Amino acid sequence: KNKTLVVTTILSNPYCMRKESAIPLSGNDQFEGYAVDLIHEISKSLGFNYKIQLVPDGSYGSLNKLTGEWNGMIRELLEQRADLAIADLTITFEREQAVDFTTPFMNLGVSILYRKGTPIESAEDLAKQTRIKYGALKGGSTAAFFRDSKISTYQRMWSFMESARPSVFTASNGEGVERVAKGKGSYAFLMESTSIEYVTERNCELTQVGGMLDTKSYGIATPPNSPYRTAINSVILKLQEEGKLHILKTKWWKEKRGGGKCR
Amino acid sequence: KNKTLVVTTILSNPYCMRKESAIPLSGNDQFEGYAVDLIHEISKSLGFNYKIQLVPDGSYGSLNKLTGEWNGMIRELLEQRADLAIADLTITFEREQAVDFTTPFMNLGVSILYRKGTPIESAEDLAKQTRIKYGALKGGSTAAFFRDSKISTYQRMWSFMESARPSVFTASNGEGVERVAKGKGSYAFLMESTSIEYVTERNCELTQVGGMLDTKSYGIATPPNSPYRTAINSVILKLQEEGKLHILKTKWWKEKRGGGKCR
Ligand SMILES: N[C@@H](CCC(=O)O)C(=O)O
Ligand SMILES: N[C@@H](CCC(=O)O)C(=O)O
Numbered sequence: 001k002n003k004t005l006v007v008t009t010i011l012s013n014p015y016c017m018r019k020e021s022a023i024p025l026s027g028n029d030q031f032e033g034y035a036v037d038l039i040h041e042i043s044k045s046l047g048f049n050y051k052i053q054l055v056p057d058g059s060y061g062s063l064n065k066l067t068g069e070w071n072g073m074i075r076e077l078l079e080q081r082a083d084l085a086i087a088d089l090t091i092t093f094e095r096e097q098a099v100d101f102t103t104p105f106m107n108l109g110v111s112i113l114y115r116k117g118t119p120i121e122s123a124e125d126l127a128k129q130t131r132i133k134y135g136a137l138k139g140g141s142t143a144a145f146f147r148d149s150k151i152s153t154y155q156r157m158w159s160f161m162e163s164a165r166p167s168v169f170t171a172s173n174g175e176g177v178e179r180v181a182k183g184k185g186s187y188a189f190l191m192e193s194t195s196i197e198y199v200t201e202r203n204c205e206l207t208q209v210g211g212m213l214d215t216k217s218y219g220i221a222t223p224p225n226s227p228y229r230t231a232i233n234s235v236i237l238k239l240q241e242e243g244k245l246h247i248l249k250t251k252w253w254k255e256k257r258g259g260g261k262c263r
Numbered sequence: 264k265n266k267t268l269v270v271t272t273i274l275s276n277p278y279c280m281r282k283e284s285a286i287p288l289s290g291n292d293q294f295e296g297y298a299v300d301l302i303h304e305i306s307k308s309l310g311f312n313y314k315i316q317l318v319p320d321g322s323y324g325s326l327n328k329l330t331g332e333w334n335g336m337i338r339e340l341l342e343q344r345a346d347l348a349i350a351d352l353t354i355t356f357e358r359e360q361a362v363d364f365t366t367p368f369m370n371l372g373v374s375i376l377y378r379k380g381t382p383i384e385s386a387e388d389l390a391k392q393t394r395i396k397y398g399a400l401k402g403g404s405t406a407a408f409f410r411d412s413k414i415s416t417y418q419r420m421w422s423f424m425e426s427a428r429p430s431v432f433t434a435s436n437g438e439g440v441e442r443v444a445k446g447k448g449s450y451a452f453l454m455e456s457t458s459i460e461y462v463t464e465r466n467c468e469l470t471q472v473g474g475m476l477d478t479k480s481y482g483i484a485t486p487p488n489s490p491y492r493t494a495i496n497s498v499i500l501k502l503q504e505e506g507k508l509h510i511l512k513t514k515w516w517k518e519k520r521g522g523g524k525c526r
């Protein structure tokens with residue numbers, strides 16, 4: 001009951017955002033968002049206290065094959081500096097070899113963020129040209145999807161992205177969004193559908209292009225042999241069945257920070 | 264492994280179906296479908312043999328609350344008469360208290376199966392009348408969703424279903440489909456969206472009414488603390504990422520047994 005867990009997370013709209021505040025904030029009070037609410041609900045049900053700490057390297061977690069070393073939130077778990085990672089963190093085979101994910105709390109797939117009203121209607125339309133540049137978050141699961149694909153269209157896109165100069169990869173979703181929004185049609189961003197929907201609810205000149213290219217989920221990551229994973233799974237399923245995960249999705253995707261006004 | 268596992272499953276289109284054969288079949292060879300293909304892939308990767316056994320009481324698994332006894336596939340796992348349950352088996356909070364689950368292999372939600380072309384557009388449209396009767400699979404997660412809901416619409420529908428001339432509940436999805444088809448508008452069946460889609464791909468006079476009422480997943484269930492769950496979990500993620508789960512979905516939902524012919 002007096003247990004205090006360290007939660008690693010990452011700034012990504014609307015999962016975890018700095019509050020809009022002209023006065024100084026500190027601690028957990030600095031942050032809000034879907035993931036902040038989710039960990040609050042989990043901590044209440046299971047009766048622990050927690051400290052939110054942004055991952056110092058601003059990375060989700062990738063594996064360097066040369067060194068065999070992880071970075072990002074995954075590394076914070078493996079090095080025992082965090083007890084839980086709660087974010088838009090994709091459950092991947094590769095990460096699950098190193099850490100243990102909970103059952104999912106959100107489903108998604110890779111898609112395309114671009115401006116509205118253009119001839120680009122699909123990934124095929126992007127891969128077939130070079131006028132519009134396109135990229136993805138560096139080191140994330142979207143980039144890995146393209147890198148590891150054996151579909152010709154996605155192999156062609158990966159080759160284009162790896163070869164492009166200056167880099168088409170971004171350090172964050174937010175950077176990708178800004179590059180689309182201010183790019184005057186010269187850039188499209190490969191982005192997770194959930195994260196796209198937050199943007200398109202608020203920037204009425206942007207849209208998701210095409211459908212989802214794969215299917216995947218976010219889950220809470222825990223270190224190997226964590227004594228909390230199983231209890232958290234029950235909380236997630238309870239919140240799911242009670243409808244509270246959907247309420248939190250509506251709150252952050254349609255209501256907070258000017259959502260839902262694109263006519 | 265090596266090793267021979269018992270897999271419990273249940274007849275449900277297209278997850279597990281008896282092959283159509285002039286000659287009586289025996290053993291695993293009598294079955295086919297998405298779940299059969301899935302277990303085949305898992306056994307290939309992990310190197311084990313398996314025996315498919317239909318759950319003898321033909322039930323998914325419900326908890327008699329005052330008795331505390333489970334039935335169905337869940338009971339086969341608890342009694343260690345099966346090593347894995349591989350079916351259109353919903354990951355529920357209640358089941359998670361008793362057995363373990365893998366990460367999901369498929370996502371879905373409750374929806375409505377009814378005839379095409381009517382003015383019924385939503386659950387509310389059914390709830391506000393009494394002419395058209397509606398029901399669900401007895402003892403499944405769809406019925407539980409309605410029984411435990413605090414939404415007035417779904418409380419009204421639950422109250423209607425619990426009181427009945429003949430029961431509006433069914434023993435299988437297939438029974439519910441046949442009651443819709445032969446009911447000529449007198450009956451709607453509350454049914455999982457995945458299973459609806461198999462039907463509406465093949466019976467062009469039936470349709471899904473409205474959207475999904477909740478969000479949930481199927482996963483493979485094991486006895487609690489099974490030593491095989493972790494390994495199977497990783498295979499599911501690998502198959503997901505390779506696109507093989509989607510290939511299997513397309514196979515059974517769009518191709519097999521006359522799929523894909525409705526305009
Ligand atoms: N959710 C992704 C990051 C975003 C992306 O790659 O598109 C991950 O966990 O790696
Ligand atoms: N998949 C459900 C059965 C079908 C239903 O309830 O609609 C379960 O596992 O209980």
Ligand code: NA
Pocket residue numbers: 095096097098099100101
């Ligand atoms: Na793991």
